[PDB]
Amino acid sequence: SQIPASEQETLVRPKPLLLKLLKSVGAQKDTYTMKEVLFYLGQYIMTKRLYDEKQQHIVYCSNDLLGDLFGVPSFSVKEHRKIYTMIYRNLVVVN
Numbered sequence: 785s786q787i788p789a790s791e792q793e794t795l796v797r798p799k800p801l802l803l804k805l806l807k808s809v810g811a812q813k814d815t816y817t818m819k820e821v822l823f824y825l826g827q828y829i830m831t832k833r834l835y836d837e838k839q840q841h842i843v844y845c846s847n848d849l850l851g852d853l854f855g856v857p858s859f860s861v862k863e864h865r866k867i868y869t870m871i872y873r874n875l876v877v878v879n
């Protein structure tokens with residue numbers, strides 16, 4: 785819809801700050817798929833309860849490493865294209 789299914793198959797190498805976050809939720813490796821990166825970031829948000837309990841579409845991250853990563857104090861989980869750009873700040877695509 786917003787995102788082609790093929791995007792999930794993209795292979796990526798996280799930069800240090802993203803790697804730091806991923807290591808708190810998932811197995812370390814040099815190269816991830818975007819399916820993996822997205823899953824792990826989602827799990828990070830859920831475990832650390834960075835979403836508004838009463839307004840669950842909004843992630844609040846100004847008091848968290850995630851805010852440094854994404855460069856925003858908050859965002860909506862519905863804004864998928866924006867999320868991909870924020871993630872892409874922090875990785876290199878490998879091919």
Ligand SMILES: COc1ccccc1-n1nc2c(c1C(C)C)[C@H](c1ccc(Cl)cc1C)N(c1cc(Cl)ccc1OCCN(C)C)C2=O
Nearest residue numbers: 822823825826827829830835840842843861862864867868
């Ligand atoms: C605070 O959020 C919630 C609270 C309660 C329930 C759900 C959610 N919640 N909603 C969504 C997410 C979550 C959490 C974080 C897993 C993730 C998502 C959002 C942000 C990031 Cl960085 C990573 C992921 C996986 N996400 C999303 C983002 C993109 Cl760019 C592409 C597809 C996505 O999901 C498609 C639907 N899926 C459930 C199968 C959503 O639409």
Ligand SMILES: [Cl-]
Nearest residue numbers: 847848849850
């Ligand atoms: Cl933190």
